[PDB]
């Protein structure tokens, strides 16, 4: 199954609450939204896969922003251990393959 791309983009761009117009505070919203939008990469039309790719790039940008933006004024140093899984397609491809985890 795949949803309407307009619904996913509208969920991305229009939020209730003000604290959700700062992606670094909630990165787990976009992970779920990209989980919902994965099967759009097999569609013959080309923008449909571009939605999923755009979500992955935005997730990576948000993570980089958080790490640098926190290392700068403070002095806390962040690590990128098992975090890169969220901007590669293999984490999302496993949710539509019959093997039932968690």
């Amino acid at each position: 199954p795949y949803p309407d791309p307009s619904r996913i983009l509208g969920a991305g761009c229009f939020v209730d609450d003000i604290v959700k117009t700062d992606g670094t505070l909630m990165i787990e919203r976009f992970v779920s939204l990209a989980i919902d939008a994965y099967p759009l990469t097999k569609h013959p039309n080309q923008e449909y896969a571009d939605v999923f790719h755009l979500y992955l790039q935005y997730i990576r940008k948000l993570h980089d922003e958080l790490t640098g933006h926190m290392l700068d004024m403070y002095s806390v140093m962040l690590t990128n251990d098992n975090t890169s899984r969220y901007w590669e397609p293999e984490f999302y491809e496993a949710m539509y393959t019959p093997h039932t985890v968690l």
Partner: peptide, 21 residues
């Protein structure tokens, strides 16, 4: 400790942000 400092920074930033709307 790193995770705890991260969480407190996030809470402080959200509280700041919701006061300049």
């Amino acid at each position: 400790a790193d995770q705890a400092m991260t969480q407190m920074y996030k809470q402080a930033r959200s509280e700041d942000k919701r006061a300049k709307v």
